[PDB]
């Protein structure tokens, strides 16, 4: 759920997460997806392709077990549709760690509609 996957976000990056992610760039937060605008967002970008996977199961209000452990997120014993949920939210945390050094604070609140439609397949 929307839950688990800002624990994460919070544990990987120390950012509040609504505030750095909820709408950011092209991809991030609300709103669908887009050409992303650097690599912050196309984290999102790939999340939100990740989630289309999640056929018996919803993203955002679904519950479901990891730990944060020794710096790792560890997806814990759930059912497939939700350990899938897991794994995508936890690679997202993951890939916006990875590319801190990058977050544009101009994109943190950003016009999607202004946004360019991708073209790329999930």
């Known amino acids: 759920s929307l839950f688990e996957l800002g624990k994460m976000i919070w544990q990987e990056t120390g950012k509040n997460p609504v505030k750095n992610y909820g709408l950011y760039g092209c991809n991030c937060g609300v709103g669908g997806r887009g050409e992303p605008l650097d690599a912050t967002d196309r984290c999102c970008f790939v999340h939100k392709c990740c989630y289309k ?3 018996d199961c919803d993203s955002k209000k679904d519950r479901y077990s990891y730990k944060w452990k020794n710096k790792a ?3 814990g014993k759930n059912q497939p ?3 899938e949920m897991c794994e995508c939210d936890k690679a997202f945390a993951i890939c916006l760690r990875e590319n801190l050094d990058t977050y544009n604070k101009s ?3 950003h016009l999607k509609p202004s946004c360019k439609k991708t073209s790329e397949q999930c």
């Open 107 to 109: 994109f943190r609140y």
């Open 73 to 75: 997120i560890v997806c």
């Open 81 to 83: 549709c939700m350990q």
């Open 53 to 55: 996977k999640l056929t």
